């Protein structure tokens, strides 16, 4: 709802759901289960016509979420550790890839 | 039961690749990680590197990055591992593993595949 | 890296004779280190996780104990399919290490 993030061609997703994720290790698991609030839980992209494929879309999804989450997050005087990078990168990802499947199905 | 299927062995010869299958049963596949172990002939055991199969996110021993690749196949819960450029340094047995529901003790071991590199 | 040091590298038991063997790690790990059963020509088997939890169908003669960087493996009385290789692993970062393991053999 109100998807239109206007800008500059982007588009911003509805909220899904925070998955469960494992990441191989006891303490990263710890980490995220208790740092996973600080990520985005909705992605930015352009127009799914605008891709070749689904690898090009879901790079730059997440790509510009991730720079757009972390203007707002140092604005708020917060910082992320290349943990929260790699972590956020998988997390964004997966919801990137999500939303190209809604995206490339809106075709019908 | 649990089960990790492995091909017994492989004849490889120097300069070539293979890809050796790891086939889980008799649990819910993307639940758990996957795992590679190598151990060379009287020698111990190394870490090559892991696998989510729920969305592929992988983890290497950094020496294997480069070297192993790891996938898996959803549909027939099996998991992959690749080995590029073959020497005989690459001669050894490669186990897959399981570890636990957000633990990460390798509970179940397949029988591994012992790869003989020689031309 | 987290370097796991093993030692005995060799150790000669009688057999019914209670044995450990130990573990030591360069870095704090909490309890974050198993250990692996591996007898000639067949796969290393999960006998003791999290320092000392036990593993369903792995006999109670089998403990472990310790926290931090420490860690002791114990056999309280040695069947003779005991006689194997016996490797620590951690999990707490990546990568994941082992040790070098010890090896059990009977004394005569």
């Known amino acids: 709802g109100a998807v239109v993030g206007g800008l500059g061609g982007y588009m911003l997703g509805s909220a899904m759901s925070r998955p469960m994720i494992h990441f191989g290790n006891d303490w990263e698991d710890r980490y995220y289960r208790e740092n996973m609030y600080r990520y985005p839980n909705q992605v930015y992209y352009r127009p799914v016509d605008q891709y070749s494929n689904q690898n090009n879309f879901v790079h730059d999804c997440v790509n510009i979420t991730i720079k757009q989450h972390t203007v707002t997050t140092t604005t708020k005087g917060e910082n992320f550790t290349e943990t929260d990078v790699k972590m956020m990168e998988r997390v964004v990802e997966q919801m990137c890839v999500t939303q190209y499947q809604k995206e490339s199905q809106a075709y019908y | 039961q649990v089960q990790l299927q492995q091909s017994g062995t492989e004849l490889v010869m120097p300069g070539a690749s293979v890809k050796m299958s790891c086939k889980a049963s008799?649990?819910?596949?993307?639940?758990?990680?996957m795992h590679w172990v190598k151990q060379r002939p009287g020698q111990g055991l190394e870490w090559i590197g892991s696998?989510?199969?729920?969305?592929?996110?992988?983890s290497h021993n950094e020496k294997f990055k480069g070297k192993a690749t790891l996938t898996v196949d959803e549909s027939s819960s099996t998991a992959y591992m690749q080995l590029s450029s073959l020497t005989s340094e690459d001669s050894a047995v490669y186990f897959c593993?399981?570890?636990?529901?957000?633990?990460?003790?390798?509970?179940?071991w397949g029988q591994g595949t012992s790869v003989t590199v020689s031309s | 890296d987290i370097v796991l040091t093993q030692s005995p590298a060799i150790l000669s038991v009688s057999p019914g004779e209670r044995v450990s063997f130990s573990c030591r790690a360069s870095?704090?790990?909490?309890?974050?280190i198993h250990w692996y059963q591996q007898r000639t020509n067949e796969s290393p088997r999960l006998i003791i996780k999290?320092?000392?939890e036990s593993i369903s169908g792995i006999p109670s003669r089998f403990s472990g104990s310790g926290s931090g960087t420490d860690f002791t493996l114990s056999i309280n009385s040695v069947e003779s399919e005991d006689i194997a290789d016996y490797y620590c692993?951690?999990?707490?970062?990546?990568?994941?290490?082992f040790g070098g393991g010890t090896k059990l053999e009977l004394k005569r």
């Open positions: 593993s399981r570890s636990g529901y957000g633990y990460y003790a390798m509970e179940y």
């Open positions: 008799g649990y819910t596949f993307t639940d758990y990680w």
């Open positions: 696998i989510d199969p729920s969305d592929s996110y992988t």
């Open positions: 870095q704090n790990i909490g309890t974050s």
């Open positions: 999290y320092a000392s």
């Open positions: 692993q951690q999990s707490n970062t990546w990568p994941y290490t």
